[PDB]
Write a protein that binds this ligand. Sequence first.
Ligand SMILES: [Sr+2]
Ligand SMILES: [Zn+2]
Ligand SMILES: [Zn+2]
Ligand SMILES: [Zn+2]
Ligand SMILES: [Zn+2]
Lengths: 248, 242
Amino acid sequence: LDVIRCICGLYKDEGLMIQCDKCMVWQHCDCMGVNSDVEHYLCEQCDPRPVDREVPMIPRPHYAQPGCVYFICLLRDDLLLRQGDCVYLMRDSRRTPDGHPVRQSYRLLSHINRDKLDIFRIEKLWKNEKEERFAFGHHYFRPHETHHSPSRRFYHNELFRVPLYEIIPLEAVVGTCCVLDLYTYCKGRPKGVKEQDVYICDYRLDKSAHLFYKIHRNRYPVCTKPYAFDHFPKKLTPKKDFSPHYVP
Amino acid sequence: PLDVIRCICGLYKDEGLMIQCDKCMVWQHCDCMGVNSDVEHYLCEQCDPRPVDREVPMIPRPHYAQPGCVYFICLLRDDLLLRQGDCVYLMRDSRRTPDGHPVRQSYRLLSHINRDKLDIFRIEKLWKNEKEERFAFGHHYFRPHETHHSPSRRFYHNELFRVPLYEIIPLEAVVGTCCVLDLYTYCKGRPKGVKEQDVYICDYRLDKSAHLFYKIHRNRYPVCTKPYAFDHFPKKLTPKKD
Ligand SMILES: [Sr+2]
Ligand SMILES: [Zn+2]
Ligand SMILES: [Zn+2]
Ligand SMILES: [Zn+2]
Ligand SMILES: [Zn+2]
């Protein structure tokens, strides 16, 4: 089936890869510490061995500052985060309106209401000169955060891409979520994602957040193969019956 | 260097303009692959299959070249690529035609191959004539029994002697390649792919008479000892002359 089960948890078939001699899963040569010239190989499940779950960008980027190392995936304690992952973020706690957004540790959160957390797309991960983990990416706006006509209706799980970028400490990540296009949302669900953490986004906003532009190319496409994606028996037909203005 | 050189010529010279394959990381002569030295995206013939010509001409055509002759770095003898510097087995079976002129026959005629019943020859030049007939130029190696030596003189079992006896040969007269090394190299290791039976030692040259023996100081064709090209013996060999 050409199954990819790497430690990084990404399905990209870009670059050198290596197959296991027992379970037949493909893994990135860069993520594991192995050449493509090796004639025999076993994965970390078939051949249990220490694995560093934090994988550096092996083509080290040019924009990399000395002392800092860019990563394709990092660990937030026990939770693995990857480039292209959507996450829930702790709120901005600043009482100074001019100050930088201060987002506290996830460990301080009392009870998890995901609707009260900011949703964010990780574009970059890196360890700094002090080995502190950071992420860079853009925000997704919830429907109530947008300027719209009272007539406008949304999906209850609809979000909107916004050209608002931020550097965050990795501790500010509460958990992962899944942001799909409508078509993909209707077809199936990526393996190991909760129904309650699946959102729809087809539109981006301008800076005023009054203008709604259709997204043409999804920047981070999901693997649709059966080992990675659970196809629904029938395509969903969700309803745009949610209004931020008119809520109980 | 950690430079792996794998070109269609099969030579290991880091000399000349080189280009690296962005997939396998091997280096190839720009001059053999028909590419400029500064091509942003390069892939070799194995990573990006395409028609190649293994018969690579000498881009600086040599002065004093024979008229109507195109010179080459490497030429194909059927399926065997032969290169400048190669040591080869040569057919002894020959034919006369107009005058005395004996000419060595094709290797296709040979049924059973005996190494000792062939001549060892070093190829220096390779060319195609006007009719695209392939030829090689170079000098012979002499076996010990072919040398006029003092009765007391001892030899290695595979010892050969360089002689200034040059000949134009039709490429068809080549039976196969062998490997001629100095003692030091012979003792250190083997080039990849070579049979021991095709490995010989030469440290001395003779005169046209083959009575006088002179030690060679400068190897005309030094062999690449890089691990990708050369397997090193874990311990130096200890051959004894008798
Ligand atoms: Sr290049
Ligand atoms: Zn990987
Ligand atoms: Zn396995
Ligand atoms: Zn070449
Ligand atoms: Zn290549």
